[PDB]
Paper text:
Multifunctional autoprocessing repeats-in-toxin ([name]) toxins, secreted by multiple Gram-negative bacteria, are primary virulence factors that promote initial colonization, dissemination, and lethality in a wide range of hosts, including humans. By doing this, the clinical strain [name] MO6-24/O generates a [name] toxin (MARTXVv) containing four effectors, which are arranged in the following order: domain of unknown function in the first position (DUF1), the Rho inactivation domain ([name]), the α/β hydrolase domain (ABH), and a Makes caterpillars floppy-like effector (MCF) with a cysteine protease domain (CPD). Previously, we reported that DUF1 and [name] within MARTXVv are not uncoupled by activated CPD in host cells; rather, they are discharged as a duet (it is assumed that the DUF1-[name] effector module acts as a functional unit). The data show that DUF1 acts as a [name]-dependent transforming [name] domain ([name]) that disrupts NAD+ homeostasis by hijacking calmodulin.
Residue numbers in the entry:
A (entry chain B): 4 to 148
B (entry chain A): 1967 to 2371
The structure:
């Protein structure tokens, strides 16, 4: 299922995290490595994944093992949709357009390490019209660029 | 100077910022987020009845208000409340302070200002009390006298509404609606007030994850966030797991980030897509009621993920607490939010190359826990990573992959 572009990226990321040059990371570094490649499992999914791959009990993950677990992950998730869904929750009347102030509340709350400026401009180009209303479909397709 | 007016202004700045889009703030009226304002004109007819009841409460309750002010304070309360006077409710709090009501957490520097928007608060309070090794004791909003006494007067108004206006009379119900909304925003304002007392790392008790629109979402977290981007608050530790899964654990990692994936999101059926509420009659017509909480299959973490992609080196902020930003001769690494003087440097051959930014981002991820661990100067040149602290070393060699020394 995995392309040449991906395995090579995974390979680079993996090898930086394997620090003793033997070609294995530990159990606890997995989620870190994965999240650095744009795949965030739950604590649960990251236990299932860990208990399966660590059936021998040596807390060892090959690149091959890593390649396997990352293939299964990505089969499952749709990033693009999952964000658009998340913004939908804030459309009380449907119609695809949530308020510009609401969008300020979302981002300041879910913007874990954002800053007031970084927020402020988000809202500015959130929607370039003088209306409160902001397109949330537009917003993601803008940030996904 | 009063401490409360200190945090009150903080709170006001926050509120004004959130109002930049809606621009309803008339700087004699500062709006509380998610609390609608409901003015009602029943003149001084009703006002003097109310104030005298409130006056009587204060006077005939055992409290730290001197009884000369029994009615002066009663006036200031109902007046700050019903008229949504920012200035007057700050004064009210200041007057409480002046009587010996602290709006400060009780246990000085050992106070872990914590927040509890939950059901089985009983069990959590002490699993957290118990896990504290430092001699530091968790405190909640109920634990601070000034906030407590403020809510007490605020309840009296509420009761007076239910007890002196019965809502069958049409204009009578309108004053009660006003009272409710007015007294409700007091509790909102006072909540932000309490949140600004947050320092270092904070626990949020929130069994079953996040509830969109709750006092946390509206008036607690945004204050905590502002406190965070001023470098005053560290981690916000949400406890959504059943209290069972926080035993055999240190204070270190009790609670996780609401941004962390597999955090529950729930919303009230009341005003949760009212026409779509009806649509949600399919499984059970009388399954979802106004007060019912609906769990949602959305991921707040998906928002934080998006952020990572939009903002260069964002992922270093969250997982490492490193703000690197576009520099002059290279990249500047600071400890987030990059407010303290200290800074180190990052230099790449082609800084505009997104591929090379990820290499050193991953690099840093794998090598350094914090800002204090990093060499003063770090270089990515010709697929080798070099570090100058006080001598010079090279440690990255990318022959299709990363080997060290
Ligand atoms: Ca190894
Ligand atoms: Ca193994
Ligand atoms: Ca809408
Ligand atoms: Ca717009």
């Amino acid at each position: 299922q995995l392309t040449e572009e991906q395995i090579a990226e995974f390979k680079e990321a993996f090898s930086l995290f394997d620090k003793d040059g033997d070609g294995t990371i530990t159990t606890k570094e997995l989620g870190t490595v994965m999240r650095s490649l744009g795949q965030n499992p739950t604590e649960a999914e990251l236990q299932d994944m860990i208990n399966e791959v660590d059936a021998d009990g040596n807390g060892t993950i090959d690149f091959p093992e890593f390649l396997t677990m990352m293939a299964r992950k990505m089969k499952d998730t749709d990033s693009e949709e999952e964000i658009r869904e998340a913004f939908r929750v804030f459309d009380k009347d449907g119609n695809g357009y949530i308020s510009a102030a609401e969008l300020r509340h979302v981002m300041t709350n879910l913007g874990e390490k954002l800053t007031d400026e970084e927020v402020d401009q988000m809202i500015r180009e959130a929607d370039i019209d003088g209306d409160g209303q902001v397109n949330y479909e537009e917003f993601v397709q803008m940030m996904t660029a | 100077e009063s401490l409360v007016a200190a945090r009150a202004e903080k709170v006001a700045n926050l509120y004004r910022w959130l109002d930049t889009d809606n621009d309803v703030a008339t700087d004699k009226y500062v709006p509380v987020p998610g609390f609608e304002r409901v003015d009602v004109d029943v003149s001084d007819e009703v006002k003097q009845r109310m104030i005298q009841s409130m006056s009587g409460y204060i006077e005939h309750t055992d409290n730290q208000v001197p009884k000369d002010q029994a009615e002066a304070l009663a006036t200031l309360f109902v007046e700050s409340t019903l008229d949504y006077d920012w200035d007057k409710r700050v004064e009210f709090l200041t007057k409480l302070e002046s009587y010996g009501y602290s709006f400060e957490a009780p246990h000085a520097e050992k106070s872990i200002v914590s927040f509890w928007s939950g059901k089985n608060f009983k069990q959590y309070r002490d699993i957290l009390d118990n896990a504290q090794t430092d001699g530091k004791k968790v405190v909640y909003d109920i634990d601070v006298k000034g906030n407590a006494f403020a809510i007490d007067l605020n309840k009296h108004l509420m009761r007076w509404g239910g007890l002196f206006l019965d809502p069958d009379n049409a204009e009578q119900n309108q004053l009660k609606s006003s009272i409710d909304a007015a007294t409700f925003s007091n509790t909102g304002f006072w909540s932000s007030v309490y949140a600004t007392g947050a320092q270092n790392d904070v626990y949020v008790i929130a069994e079953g994850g996040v509830r969109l629109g709750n006092y946390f979402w509206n008036v607690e977290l945004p204050a905590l966030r502002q406190l965070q981007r001023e470098g005053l608050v560290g981690e916000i530790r949400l406890l959504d797991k059943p209290v069972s899964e926080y035993k055999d654990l240190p204070a270190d990692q009790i609670g996780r980030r609401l941004t962390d994936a597999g955090v529950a999101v729930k919303v009230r059926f009341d005003a949760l897509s009212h026409e779509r509420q009806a649509e949600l009659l399919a499984d059970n017509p009388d399954g979802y009621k106004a007060d019912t909480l609906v769990e949602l299959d959305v991921k707040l973490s998906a928002i934080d993920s998006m952020l990572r992609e939009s903002l260069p080196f964002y992922s270093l902020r969250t997982e490492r607490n490193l703000l690197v930003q576009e520099g002059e001769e290279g990249f500047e690494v600071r400890s987030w939010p990059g407010i303290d003087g200290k800074s180190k440097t990052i230099l790449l051959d082609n800084p505009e190359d997104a591929a090379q930014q990820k290499s050193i981002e991953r690099f840093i991820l794998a090598n350094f826990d914090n800002f204090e661990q990093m060499p003063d100067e770090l270089f990515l040149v010709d697929n080798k990573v070099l570090s100058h602290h006080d001598g010079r070393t090279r440690i990255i060699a990318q022959k299709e992959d990363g080997a060290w020394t």
